[PDB]
């Protein structure tokens, strides 16, 4: 008996939640797999956004029903953890929820289903770790290209997949980083991505260094420096304030002029101290005043203003320069040291699409990687940068975990039958949940085929037949195989075909899907409240 | 801003269309809209459709003409092709599907040439000459000139094509029943009139149990007894079964006492005499659409007479034809010669529905009826529509002759022959004729799309096997073998006249729509 809203219980709300989950599934059901077809959103005012990556779609799609919000947040988390599988994980969650409900829709007690699901997830991850493929023996760049171009289909760039994979692997190997003293961690998002409409991705270029989306401050100031004198400076450049409250009171007028004089001479001497070091390149997130600009021109150095903090931090990491929030010393006097300087072979501002952007090539301290995109419109460019970010994510996963999974749905292809066999072991009722888990998880090949528009039942049956054969005659070195394809509409060996996915993708995907199913299935009543 | 100019204010609010822009783009787009609307329609693999009218009445349908009748359309040339197909149906039966597909294909390929800059008038010339050439070459394709008049087997095999087309599940039953209908009806009022077959809908008892009676049926009550005589004597009366009331306002008048007694008594006595005279000729059953006097039915019960009620004019006409006895506007003369003769008449229960049955045996020929049984009345509408289309098919067959090999095979031969004539045409119209020839690939294309197999190589293999004169080989219906089938052995035939007429009407619709360039539209 609650004001400002009714309540729904039992079958009604269960069916409602399944209905919402199926809706969300069908929202993205058409954007997965090497024949996935991307989505696009007329926002409300024309600023459209083409994208096939599911998490982006979910974030940009307003949602009101609770369970759908749950799925959206799950997709966002998955993106924060893998990069793709938002192609997949939402579908997995929805399908598992659907079949679990179908069991419950009869009578079956939910907690039994939950326990069965938990067992299913644990069994599945164990079987995957018995199904793993190790890349260490395999050629590094080879499998990296494979995983990349595997992710590259279902995207705008899958056609140029070969070139794009080459570029991506080069960048990621160039962004090596020594971690906690025992880990070669590779930072995603460390590589810099800039979009620039114009030429095709054919002409999109990899930068053996770092690239700036900034401009030269003073037109008279030069354009290219073949020398590596690069200094960073957080400390802004203005004729300084008194900066807290310091009122200036005059009882002897004879000194106002000299006061004003040093009001700029302070910045003048700071600049001269900087330049006497011989630094020819300066960057600054803070403001840059014309006073400094003209001094720099007379010195002929390089100056950039209003640069984003992350970019300059990356600059310090690459060139080996030191981020400097100010000028100071262990002693009070403000000095500057050449040791603070970073180096790079040549720094150029260049005109791409009549917009001058600043390039930094071959920092000697630490190799950096940046990528420039070229395309027709801003829509294609930013959707492809989303794609590339996913690419770098998956390659990072591959390097971090020397372990790979055969792509194209071999995962659930094996999993369905293996869990089917394992189900009879339990003997309880929960093997019914196990079997439904398997059958639902069989959705990925179904969606693959339908988006590829051929007889899906026959492909799925052939897949299951091959895997079941792989579960007969345990001499499976010549009887264990793995694979599935779409372009020819018939099975293959993805291991030979190079269709690979990182293990963590499927692992974390199944785990999060199981958690989502547990959360939503335990629902049996919503109670609404009209707002204040 | 906000104020361009008009050099012509002639219109009070209306649509002026001009500049070939409408012909080049908008009209063509409307035709393609219709084409997509019923592309799924035709096909043994074509799946049925439902539509509700503006008055919220269901219409499960596979026929194209019926579905077009239920879409209240506004673009004009859309109406053009619609009513063209409609009249085509009025002429032959199925083909509505065919002609609409033809129209879509021809329009779509013609606009391409128009874009490549061919003269609209020259497009007209090319299309016309191509259609005429196709007409010329068509008779050379007839095979299996089925001639058997009144056998059941040949006609059943033949009507299988249309029934299978508009209903894929139940070919055998419908074939046999409609064949039984056709053979049962001889030439009596002239060459197997379509109207000679009546259809009744009775829900329940699913389709397999539907049957056919060599008589004719009524879903109405009864007034006295329920009897059948192997020599049933029927009397028909358009006039209401009552004392003939003067049309003029005739008020009975009396002057003295005994008038009342004698008048009521005489009314009784002369109704008694009239019905007795009717009984004297042995007529045991009487039918009328007019009002029945209670006195009359009372006396009929006294004399064991059967009564039939509330029939409409068409209904009593049907019954007249069934028993061959002339309806009598005069109540008196139950004349021997024009008096009914039926094998058996009774009342039965089907589907909780009182049913009057005229169960018959007639050598001279009778107008029989088919009984439809099953659950869903909408399925009754669909199935009876299909049956009537099949009856039309059989009628057209009887019109002259000459089955042609269906399954697109005929149309592939048309395409090949027309193209071959095309390169011997030369002149700028060569493109027109070539595109027209190309247009016929739409049918096998449609069969593929409703079949869900990769159309292109199907068409290619069809061409290839048609390069050896195998005019009898056509598109299969099988997922296992998305390749080919030989139509003649499969018996998948259809009528010469239907294809010929569909082609000519599609040509006419196309030549009409292409011709108009600028449009004027008053506000509705």
């Amino acid at each position: 008996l609650s004001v400002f809203g009714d309540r729904s219980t039992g079958e009604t709300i269960r069916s409602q939640n399944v209905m919402a989950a199926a809706s969300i599934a069908n929202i993205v059901k058409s954007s997965l797999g090497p024949v996935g077809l991307d989505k696009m959103l007329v926002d409300d005012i024309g600023d459209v956004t083409i994208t096939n990556d599911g998490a982006t779609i979910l974030k940009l799609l307003e949602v009101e029903h609770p369970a759908a919000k749950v799925l959206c947040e799950l997709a966002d988390l998955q993106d924060k953890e893998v990069g793709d599988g938002t192609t997949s994980v939402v579908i997995i969650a929805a399908e598992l929820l659907k079949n679990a409900d179908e069991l419950v829709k009869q009578k079956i007690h939910p907690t039994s289903v939950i326990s069965g699901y938990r067992l299913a997830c644990k069994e599945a991850v164990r079987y995957i770790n018995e199904n793993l493929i190790v890349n260490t023996d395999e050629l590094g760049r080879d499998c990296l290209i494979n995983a990349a171009k595997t992710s590259m289909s279902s995207k705008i760039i899958g056609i140029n997949g070969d070139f794009f994979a080459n570029m991506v692997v080069d960048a990621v190997l160039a962004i090596k980083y020594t971690d906690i003293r025992g880990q070669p961690r590779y930072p995603v998002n460390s590589v810099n991505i800039l979009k620039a409409h114009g030429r095709s991705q054919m002409e999109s270029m990899l930068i053996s260094g770092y690239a700036l989306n900034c401009v030269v401050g003073s037109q008279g100031m030069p354009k290219r420096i073949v020398n590596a004198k690069i200094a960073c400076l957080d400390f802004s450049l203005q004729k300084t304030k008194m900066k807290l409250g310091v009122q200036v009171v005059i009882t002897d007028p004879e000194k106002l002029d000299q006061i004003r004089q040093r009001e700029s001479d302070i910045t003048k001497e700071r600049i001269q101290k900087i330049l006497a070091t011989g630094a020819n390149v300066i960057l600054t997130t803070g403001g840059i005043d014309d006073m400094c600009l003209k001094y720099f021109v007379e010195a002929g150095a390089m100056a950039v203003r209003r640069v984003l903090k992350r970019d300059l931090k990356r600059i310090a990491k690459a060139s080996g320069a030191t981020i400097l929030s100010t000028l100071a010393n262990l002693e009070g006097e403000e000095t500057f040291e050449a040791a603070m300087l970073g180096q790079a072979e040549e720094v150029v501002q260049e005109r791409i699409c009549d917009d001058e952007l600043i390039l930094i090539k071959n920092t000697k301290a630490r190799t950096s990687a940046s990528i420039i995109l070229r395309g027709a419109n801003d829509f294609m460019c930013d959707e492809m940068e989303r794609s590339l970010h996913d690419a770098l994510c998956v390659v990072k996963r591959v390097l971090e975990s020397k372990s790979v999974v055969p792509g194209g749905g071999a995962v659930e292809a094996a999993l369905s039958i293996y869990l089917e066999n394992y189900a009879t072991s339990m003997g309880s009722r929960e093997q019914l949940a196990i079997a439904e888990f398997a059958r639902s998880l069989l959705v990925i090949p179904n969606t693959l085929a339908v988006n590829a528009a051929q007889d899906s039942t026959d492909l799925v049956a052939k897949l299951r037949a091959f895997h079941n054969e792989a579960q007969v005659n345990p001499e499976r070195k010549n009887l264990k195989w793995i694979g599935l394809d779409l372009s020819n509409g018939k099975p293959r060996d993805n291991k030979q075909a190079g269709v690979f996915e990182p293990t963590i993708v499927k692992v974390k995907s199944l785990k999060f899907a199981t958690e989502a199913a547990i959360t939503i299935l335990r629902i049996d009543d919503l109670i609404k409240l009209h707002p204040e | 801003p906000k104020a361009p100019g008009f050099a012509q204010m002639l219109k009070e609010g209306a649509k002026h269309f001009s500049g070939l822009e409408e012909a080049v783009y908008r009209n063509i787009q409307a035709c393609k809209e219709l084409a997509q609307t019923t592309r799924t329609a035709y096909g043994p693999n074509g799946m049925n459709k439902m539509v509700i009218n503006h008055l919220e009445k269901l219409f499960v349908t596979n026929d194209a003409a019926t579905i077009l009748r239920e879409l209240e359309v506004q673009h004009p040339a859309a109406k053009m092709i619609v009513m063209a197909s409609h009249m085509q149906e009025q002429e032959v039966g199925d083909g509505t599907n065919f002609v609409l597909v033809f129209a879509g294909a021809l329009l779509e390929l013609a606009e391409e040439l128009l874009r490549i800059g061919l003269s609209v008038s020259e497009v007209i010339e090319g299309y016309e000459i191509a259609c005429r050439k196709a007409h010329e070459i068509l008779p050379n394709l007839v095979c299996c000139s089925a001639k058997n008049l009144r056998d059941i087997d040949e006609v059943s095999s033949l009507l299988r094509t249309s029934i299978m087309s508009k209903q894929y599940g139940n070919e055998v039953f419908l074939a046999k029943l409609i064949a039984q209908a056709c053979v049962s009806i001889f030439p009596d009022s002239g060459h197997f009139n379509v109207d000679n077959i009546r259809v009744c809908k009775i829900l329940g008892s699913g389709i397999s149990s539907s049957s056919v009676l060599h008589g004719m049926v009524f879903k109405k009550e009864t007034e006295g007894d329920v009897t059948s005589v192997k020599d049933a004597k029927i009397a028909v009366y358009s006039c209401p079964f009552d004392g003939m009331i003067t049309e003029t306002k005739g008020t009975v008048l009396i002057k003295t006492a005994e008038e009342l007694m004698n008048f009521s008594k005489g009314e009784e006595n002369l109704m008694d005499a009239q019905v007795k005279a009717i009984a004297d000729t042995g007529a045991n059953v009487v039918v009328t659409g007019g009002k029945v006097a209670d006195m009359a039915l009372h006396y009929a019960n006294k004399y064991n007479i059967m009564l039939v009620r509330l029939n409409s004019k068409w209904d009593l006409r049907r019954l007249c034809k069934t028993v061959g006895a002339t309806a009598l506007p005069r109540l008196t003369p139950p004349v021997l010669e024009e008096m009914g003769h039926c094998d058996s008449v009774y009342l039965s229960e089907v589907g909780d529905t009182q049913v009057v049955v005229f169960k018959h045996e007639k050598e001279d020929g009778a107008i029989s009826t088919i009984v439809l049984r099953g659950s869903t009345d909408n399925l009754m509408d669909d199935i009876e529509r299909a049956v009537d289309d099949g009856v039309n098919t059989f009628k057209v067959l009887t019109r002259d002759k000459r089955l042609v090999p269906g399954g697109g095979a005929t149309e592939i031969e048309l395409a090949k022959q027309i193209t071959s004539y095309g390169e011997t045409c030369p002149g700028l119209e060569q493109y027109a004729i070539k595109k027209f020839a190309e247009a016929f690939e739409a049918i096998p294309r449609a069969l593929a799309e409703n079949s869900g197999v990769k159309a292109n190589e199907v068409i290619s293999k069809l061409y290839a096997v048609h390069q050896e004169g195998n005019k009898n080989v056509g598109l299969d219906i099988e997922a296992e073998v998305p390749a080919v089938k030989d139509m003649l052995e499969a018996g998948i035939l259809d009528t010469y006249l239907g294809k010929y007429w569909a082609i000519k009407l599609a040509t006419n619709a196309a030549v009409t729509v292409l011709r108009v360039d600028q449009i004027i539209m008053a506000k509705p």
Partner: protein, 461 residues
Amino acid sequence: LVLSQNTKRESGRKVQSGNINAAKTIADIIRTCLGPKSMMKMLLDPMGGIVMTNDGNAILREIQVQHPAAKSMIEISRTQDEEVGDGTTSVIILAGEMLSVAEHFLEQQMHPTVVISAYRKALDDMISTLKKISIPVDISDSDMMLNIINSSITTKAISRWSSLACNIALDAVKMVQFEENGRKEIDIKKYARVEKIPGGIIEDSCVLRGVMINKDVTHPRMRRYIKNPRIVLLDSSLEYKKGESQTDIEITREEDFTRILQMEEEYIQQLCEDIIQLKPDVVITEKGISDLAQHYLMRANITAIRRVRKTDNNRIARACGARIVSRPEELREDDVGTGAGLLEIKKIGDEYFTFITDCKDPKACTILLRGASKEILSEVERNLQDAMQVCRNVLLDPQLVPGGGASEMAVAHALTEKSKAMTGVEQWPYRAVAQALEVIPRTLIQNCGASTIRLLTSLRA
């Protein structure tokens, strides 16, 4: 309610057909605008003005849309224009017809991705073929450059002024080369300012070896005509300025107030003799100028101009080779305005202008456009933009291609050969692309008004 409550959705073949229709319409509304026979299009802007131009990019830029793919095409046009100048007279048309043939394979139930792969192969082969059929050409030889410009402009209104247009573009572009990149100097098209002044005739417009300033002498005395001026660029204001640090003064003795009043005067003077120590002739600033400093400069016989746009300042500096300065005490003779062949201030009619011509080796320049009225002048300057853009593209690449659709037909039969050697399902899309290419010459024909079918067949054969 489930999804978003008043968000529509549409799916599948309907969406594909709708987008194709939108693209086809986008192409259609411009198909008449291409070719030397071209039409001339004019626009009603939202806020009152009138815009008339052949250039497709501006035409589309003045289009708002509702269907999204149309907006995508709009952006595509604007990008191509930005990068190359013209071709937008053709690009969207080609894209639309490309799509129109493309859709024909959708009802083939041919899934899009394979067609896409076919397109990628098509692009690769087209690029290769065009590179095979180029012609390298000298860049120094002037008249071939003029021929190129005339070719690229004989589609818009300036055609009848071809000689003047080509000379203008060649002169402007040739003299803009910042050689400070070693042998990798880059020209820039934001120092080639365009100024529209009404009156006169096209024939009166000319390249001025310098800059145009729409300002006037501040005081009568400064000479409006000088042979060899010296120019100083003061980025800073030349007057007394707020003490930025919220300073305050508390005077007590009488003389103090008048004394501080004298102090700012003295500061102004200080700046003045600091300037005059360099023997300049011309004073330019983006900021204001004190009338007292104006007095002192007048006493030194020095011309002063106030409050000019920063880009204009940069262009002037690039004109007379001097560098901008923001500190008079830090003024250096290295930034003396040497290299001004003549300083002058004329009257165009009811308005003064500033002429700085005959530089030694001017690297900056602005074009003086003098025509009939601002809208025609805007059309002229758009055409000039396109011309000078393609000229710079040539100075980046000396490779030339035969247009008039000829290259298109070469590509056509090349892809035809590749296709007939390239059996497969993708074959049909490949030759479809080939055939789709053929429409640029087609459109040329209709805009001419000749027998399109027979002419095209004769061409292809």
